[PDB]
Amino acid sequence: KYRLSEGPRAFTYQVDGEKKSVLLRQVIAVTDFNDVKAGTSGGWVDADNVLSQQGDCWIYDENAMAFAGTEITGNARITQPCTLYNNVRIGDNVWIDRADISDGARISDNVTIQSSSVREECAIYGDARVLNQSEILAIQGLTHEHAQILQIYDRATVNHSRIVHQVQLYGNATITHAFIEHRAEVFDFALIEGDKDNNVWICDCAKVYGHARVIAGTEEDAIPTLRYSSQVAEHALIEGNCVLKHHVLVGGHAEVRGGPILLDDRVLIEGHACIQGEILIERQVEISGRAAVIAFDDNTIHLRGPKVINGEDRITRTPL
């Protein structure tokens, strides 16, 4: 229960290289509902219909804007200067701390968005916490499977990352400093960790999902890059400058790191396989025992294949 201001006021809100302006009216309480006391003014709404007259949902900051088809229902909270405009949907125990929800975005259950941006039609609904300069942007998605709308929905944690097209985030996944885009998926106790020097690139259809850890290195451009159908699958550990290509899966208690590493065609690392240095594994190779393949430094090992590496195979030089 609140009332709309008597007089409007223009407001500006950034978009794509423009300075749009909208006539909003200030929201003002009337009775005490939750933690808002009767008489205190909150945010400025486009036209009562956005801020449901029911529930506890409320816009606290006197700068916050909600003006397109946006509808804030339930007990959702809007704490600081935010801007949700365009059939935006928020309405449960959702909490927006200082972000911007733009186009057809639906935030639900107990999700949390803080100082981040959610743009188009996507759905964030678990207990997902999207925060710290993150940028969610579900825009394209040509010819594949029907509007597989971009989803983040369980206990997924996105920190300073830019999730794009139709990506899915959902286990107890932890994503930090990375770029996930097309239809990639990360979703169990998966771990994505970039840093101030290198991000993490999960691209096409790739997926990360065991207790898998895809961490970035500190060397220049040490950017773990998952490119196609690839996937890190169990207790696997990928670190540093690596790029897993087409039909590639790393999954066991495998560990990959060090110099320029590339995996292509049909490759599998799955035992206690240890791979370090600049290695170029490319064809139908399998590495999965207690085997180790280590390229010292100015060296470079190149495993073409088909071939198997599983016993205490100690490779430290390219086959010939």
Beta-carbon neighbour count of residue 211 at 10 Å? 16
**Shortest distance, CB of residue 196 to a copy of itself, whole angstroms?**
6
Contact 309, 272 (CB under 8 A): no
Q: Enter the tokens of residue 9.
A: 């006021």
Query: Which listed residue (26, 112, 168, 225) binds a copy of itself by CB under 8 A?
Result: 112
**Shortest distance, CB of residue 151 to Cs ion, whole angstroms?**
18
Whole-angstrom Cα distance, residue 120 to residue 14?
15
**Shortest distance, CB of residue 49 to Cs ion, whole angstroms?**
35
Q: Which does 129 bind (CB under 5 to 8 A by kind): a copy of itself, Cs ion, none?
A: a copy of itself
| Sequence-distant (≥ 6) Cβ neighbours of residue 32 within 8 angstroms | 38
User: Of 216, 217, 215, 281, which is closest to residue 249 (Cα–Cα)?
Assistant: 281
Going by DSSP bridges, is the β-strand pair 266-269/247-250 parallel, antiparallel, or unpaired? parallel
Per-residue x/- mask for Cs ion, residues 143 to 182, rule CB under 5 A?
A: ------------------------------------x-x-
**Shortest distance, CB of residue 246 to Cs ion, whole angstroms?**
9
Q: What is the separation of C-alpha 148 from the centre of its chain, rounded to a whole number of angstroms? A: 15
Q: Which does 213 bind (CB under 5 to 8 A by kind): Cs ion, a copy of itself, none?
A: a copy of itself
Q: Does 128 bind Cs ion (CB under 5 A)?
A: no
**Residues from 228 through 267 that contact Cs ion (CB under 5 A):** 255
Whole-angstrom Cα distance, residue 91 to residue 76?
5
**Shortest distance, CB of residue 43 to Cs ion, whole angstroms?**
25
Query: Which listed residue (151, 159, 161, 168) binds a copy of itself by CB under 8 A?
Result: 159
User: Of 52, 33, 61, 44, which is closest to residue 6 (Cα–Cα)?
Assistant: 44
Nearer to Cs ion, 50 or 216 (CB): 216
Contact 177, 187 (CB under 8 A): no
Per-residue x/- mask for a copy of itself, residues 74 to 103, rule CB under 8 A?
A: ---x-xx--------------x-x------
Query: Which listed residue (132, 148, 284, 310) binds a copy of itself by CB under 8 A?
Result: 132
Beta-carbon neighbour count of residue 54 at 10 Å? 11
Token look-up 């229960």 returns: 1
Nearer to a copy of itself, 16 or 312 (CB): 312
Q: What are the distances in angstroms from CA 276 to CA 7, 201, 295?
A: 67, 20, 6
Q: Does 174 bind a copy of itself (CB under 8 A)?
A: yes
**Shortest distance, CB of residue 270 to a copy of itself, whole angstroms?**
13
Q: Does 146 bind a copy of itself (CB under 8 A)?
A: no
Selected range binding Cs ion among 2-10, 147-155, 184-192, 194-202, rule: CB under 5 A: 194-202
Contact 22, 46 (CB under 8 A): yes
- Each residue of 75-91: b (16+ CB within 10 Å) or e? bbbbbeebbbbbebbbb
Q: Enter the tokens of residue 249.
A: 């899966």
**Whole-angstrom distance between the N-terminal and C-terminal Cα of the chain?**
79
**Residues from 234 through 293 that contact a copy of itself (CB under 8 A):** 235, 237, 253, 255, 257, 272, 274, 276, 290, 292
User: Of 223, 221, 202, 102, which is closest to residue 158 (Cα–Cα)?
Assistant: 202
Binding site for a copy of itself (CB under 8 A): 77, 79-80, 95, 97, 110, 112, 114, 127, 129, 131-132, 155, 157, 159, 172, 174, 176, 189, 191, 193, 195-197, 211, 213, 215, 218-219, 235, 237, 253, 255, 257, 272, 274, 276, 290, 292, 294, 312, 314
Residues that bind Cs ion (CB under 5 A): 179, 181, 201, 203-204, 255, 274
